[PDB]
Nucleic acid binder design. Structure first.
Ligand SMILES: [Mg+2]
Length: 319
DNA sequence: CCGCAAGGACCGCATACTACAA
C-alpha cells in the first residue's frame, strides 16, 4: 500500500454543490474533502502524464483503488455515538429494547474532530470520554474578492464574490496500485491542484501501510464499524455485503448516523455536473451483533465506488 | 557685605467619529 501525503501551500476549497459563477451566485462554501476529489486530482495528474490507461477517462472509477482519505494537523470526525455533556464528550454504548439494538437517550451530538490516538482507544472500546479541549474544529478562512475593469481600476458590475476556504495542515490518501506505476509518477511531481480556485498541495509519497490498518482486535460477536469516509449504498446491501466478506450472519445491527452526505461533483470529461448520490456520512458507526464470533478486521471496504475512496470502515469492538 | 534659590490652577475639551457604488 502506498501512502500519499498532501501538504496544502495555503488554503483549500472543496466547494459544496451550489452555483458559483461570476456575475451571479457568488458564494463558495467549502465542505470536508470527499475522497473522489482526491481521486480526481490523482487521475488528472496521470491524465497529463500520458498514463491514460489507469485513469478511466469517462469512467466512474479509475483502474487503481483509493483506499480512503483522512485529514491531518491525522484526525477523524467524532463518532456519532459520542455526545457532549458539559465539558466532556461521552461515549454512549448500544442498549437493547424489544430485542433491538438502540442508542439510549443521552443528549444531542455536537460535531468535531479527534486525533487518531483517541479514535484507536474508541475502536478498542477503551474510551469513556474526551475532554472538550481535545475535540478539534476545522478552521475556516473567509475571503472576499472582486473583479476590476481592465483600465479604470474600478469594480465591474456585479463582480464581487465570497469564498469560505478551509485551513488544513495535511491530507492523507492511501492507494493500492495494480501496477500502473503511480508511486513513481507521484514522486516526479512536487505539487498538484487540489479542489477549487486553483489551490495546490505539495505531494509526498511513501510505501507504507498506516498502523491503524494493521490493528489486531481479536474475535468477538460484538463488532462495530466506524466509517472514516462516506459510504454509498442501501444499509441493507451494505450489511449483506458485510455478512459475505466476513462469512458470518448477523443477528442484529444498529446504524448510528446523521444527515446523509450529498455527493455530486464535476465531470471533467463531459464538462458538466455528476449525478447526485447519497452516502452515510463519515463518523457514522455500524454496531453489529454477529451470530458467531468473527475476527474483526482493522479495516474493510464497503458499498459503491470503493476505488474512489468511499466506504472505508475501521473495525472496532463494543460491549 | 550677608541671606534667599517657586507653587498651583489648567491637566485635551468639543465637533466630525463612514458614505457609497460596484
Ligand atoms: Mg474560480
Amino acid at each position: 500500500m502506498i501512502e500519499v501525503t498532501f501538504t496544502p501551500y495555503d488554503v483549500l476549497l472543496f466547494r459544496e454543490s451550489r452555483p458559483f459563477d461570476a456575475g451571479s451566485e457568488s458564494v463558495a462554501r467549502s465542505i470536508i474533502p470527499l475522497p473522489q476529489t482526491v481521486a480526481g486530482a490523482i487521475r488528472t495528474l496521470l491524465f497529463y502524464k500520458g498514463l491514460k490507461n489507469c485513469v478511466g477517462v469517462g469512467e466512474e472509477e479509475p483502474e487503481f483503488t483509493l483506499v480512503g482519505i483522512a485529514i491531518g494537523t491525522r484526525i477523524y470526525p467524532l463518532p456519532f455515538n459520542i455526545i457532549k455533556s458539559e465539558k466532556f464528550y461521552k461515549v454512549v454504548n448500544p442498549g437493547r429494547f424489544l430485542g433491538k439494538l438502540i442508542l439510549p437517550p443521552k443528549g444531542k451530538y455536537k460535531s468535531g474532530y479527534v486525533t487518531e490516538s483517541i479514535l484507536e482507544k474508541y475502536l478498542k472500546g477503551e474510551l469513556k470520554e474526551v475532554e472538550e479541549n481535545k475535540v478539534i474544529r476545522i478552521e475556516k478562512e473567509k475571503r472576499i474578492g472582486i473583479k476590476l475593469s481592465r483600465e479604470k481600476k474600478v469594480v465591474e458590475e456585479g463582480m464581487l464574490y465570497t469564498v469560505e476556504f478551509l485551513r488544513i495542515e495535511k491530507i492523507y490518501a492511501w492507494i493500492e496500485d495494480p501496477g500502473c506505476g503511480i508511486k513513481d509518477i507521484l514522486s516526479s511531481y512536487e505539487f498538484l491542484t487540489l479542489g477549487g480556485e486553483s489551490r495546490v498541495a505539495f505531494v509526498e509519497v511513501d510505501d507504507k501501510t498506516p498502523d491503524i490498518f494493521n490493528r489486531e482486535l481479536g474475535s468477538t460477536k460484538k463488532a462495530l464499524f466506524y466509517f472514516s469516509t462516506p459510504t454509498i449504498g442501501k444499509v441493507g446491501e451494505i450489511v449483506q455485503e458485510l455478512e459475505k466478506r466476513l462469512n458470518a450472519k448477523i443477528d442484529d445491527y444498529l446504524l448510528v448516523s446523521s444527515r446523509p452526505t450529498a455527493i455530486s461533483g464535476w465531470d471533467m470529461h463531459e464538462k458538466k455536473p455528476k449525478g447526485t448520490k447519497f452516502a452515510i456520512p463519515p463518523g457514522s458507526v455500524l454496531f453489529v451483533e454477529f451470530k458467531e464470533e468473527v475476527e474483526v478486521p482493522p479495516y474493510i471496504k464497503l458499498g459503491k465506488l470503493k476505488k474512489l475512496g468511499y466506504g472505508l470502515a475501521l473495525g472496532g469492538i463494543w460491549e
